């Protein structure tokens, strides 16, 4: 039974649990702000410095998840609110993609919206090049910030919103449940082969960014999340 | 659209938005005691009085729901761990099935183990007419004890239990994540036609039973409920 | 070598190896609940029945001890969340203040806040009366309600605190350790004479009280407990 | 406030949460065995992955920790059993000393048997020339196996010991309650500045050695721990 589980309330640099990349900053309130407001094709990213082993090559065995989290995206005159949040699950090794362009990228992908991870995205943004719905969306990414579901959502301005992600290794589902301040929920689920998709050591966190013309406050409040991985 | 949502820290005979069935009883701390310590095949049911909507018969839409608790089992001399508590979906006017056996029934089937519900079962006793596991086990069921599927578990005596659960109307997963007291999860994940196992309006709730010899506590320590359909 | 050792997983109301003084009560759960939310002025006590010896007059020789114990505070409609619970050793003829007027006394003093008695004190309200820190705190208490020595911790409704309590005879040093439900910790020592301060033949136990405005729920969950002293 | 916390039931080697130096294995049974029975002057230590802050050169600030732990000590044919288990935190960089001779340096220093680090000692072995008591011993060791101080004690072949340290960081006390076979406990406490002993970021961890006439099987199997740094 290995197990990997922590709970952030608040963040400080400094703390060796966190991995920052990127514009990533830290607020004086704990809060972690991820993109930059006056940078061009900001991009920030908070990763769990533990690398997390979620499969064993030999038992091949995949272990199952539960982690909470909490975010909010503030806008900002006179910028367009965008690109997004995403949660993701990548290459221990994983670093923002080179000459990343930001904005509809999410900070996981190349200009085609190509990268190896599989992620949850809180998009604010439809880019027609990734094939967006046509409103802010949840989605699934595998791979790709071309979602392989999305789900019609809204992202509400100074909103803090509450997520609970649990995946199942045995029918390999990633289900998403979203609350936003208004007390309604918006839920996906998806199933993906992690270990078909995803090395064995992984790490997780958190990736935002923006452009030009569009920049808005993302920021990553707290962090909760438990893994077990049936060994023997 | 159509949410339903609330959060129990504690409980309290009196509040008419609960229901009560059985030997269920409220402790002065707050806790739902579920069966009768000192009773034959004893059997407590508690239900959310208002009748939930998770499906509308004009649009065909599904609801999504987010919903966690904390249980507490606990043994005592000299009985059998027994047997165990399950968190239930069913029609609004359900009650205890009539000529109640409790036992491996878990208050909410017939002898052959057959009833009409939807639930997540926290089995620790092995009913080999139900086609138990050998061991402790978090099961989904359908219309039946007899699972349609079951995750190895292990029930701590004394130990408080967090459960989360997430049901996506979409894909019609639902998934469960256990935390158990040495920090360890466990998931179970499966699909299941909520519309068509369910009437249009149904309620939500806990029961749990024991036997002759087989007798526990069993706890409702706290709930909480979040449940959105999507309307016209 | 002379050891005492003993554990309680759960208590009953009726079990010889524990005293019950005041308003404690035992649950259906095993639960030992120490104050009546319906009294005012409430206080309750429990200890272990057999008395331990801490100390011998012939050798001189302090004895050293582990225990270990979970509790739970739980605030109720419409008291304030008081007074708390104190983990304490005092003479074997020791019993609820003459006259005690509950409240910031936690049953273990008198009206002034002086008894005979060493304990660990989790304070949920500040009495000025009694020096108490401006905040929720745990206190290392000598003869007086008025801590030695406090330290800033926050009391969690309806969590449950595990607490572990080390006494080096050598260095004459109580230290202890708190476990909040956010999972932080929290330590406090000081050194402490049992020896100067108490009787050779001690009696552990908890205690809780109330006022008129100030109740709660006051619950001692789990105790375990080893003592030894180099004898002859 | 920054946490770091986890629990070990068992290991397996693979987990990124651990590094394992020299001859340091993982058995079949989830048991850790620190030393190499064939190798002479055998040295083997497991540490967090994970560097933990326990102190701040902006705050000032030292955190407390709780931890609690069980090895085991079998002898073996036809050698000597030696020389011990150590629980120790040490510099991030910490590695097993250039050229160990292993025996009573435990592993963590030098020939004269000086070292960077803090450790709680199980010593089996009588090295006069590091002052050791004549009997088997605890003891609490600051930058050298000359322990700063020692209290008898009696290691049990086969026997698994329980053993809970706590630092408080007020008093800068380290606190030591050791569990024997036989359900008698020992305890050893000591006050040592962390801040001046040890850089900001440490890693905590066990260390066996052996020689080449004494060696016994040195295992760990299990491991519990939580600090606290109260941030800015
Ligand atoms: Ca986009
Ligand atoms: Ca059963
Ligand atoms: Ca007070
Ligand atoms: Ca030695
Ligand atoms: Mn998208
Ligand atoms: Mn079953
Ligand atoms: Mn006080
Ligand atoms: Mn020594």
Known sequence: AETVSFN???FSEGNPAINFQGDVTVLSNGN???????????VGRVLYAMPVRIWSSATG????????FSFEMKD???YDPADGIIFFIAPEDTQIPAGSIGGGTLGVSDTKGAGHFVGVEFDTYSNSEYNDPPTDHVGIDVNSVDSVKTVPWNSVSGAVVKVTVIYDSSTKTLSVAVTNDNGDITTIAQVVDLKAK???????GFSA????GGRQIHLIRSWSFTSTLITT
Chains 1, 2, 3, 4 share one sequence.
């Open 8 to 10: 952030f309330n608040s």
């Open 32 to 42: 972690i702000q991820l993109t930059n407001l006056n940078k061009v094709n900001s």
């Open 61 to 68: 065995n995949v272990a199952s998840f539960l982690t909470s």
């Open 76 to 78: 900002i005159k006179d």
């Open 198 to 204: 995803l090395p064995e050591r992984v790490k997780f």
């Open 209 to 212: 960014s923006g452009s030009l």
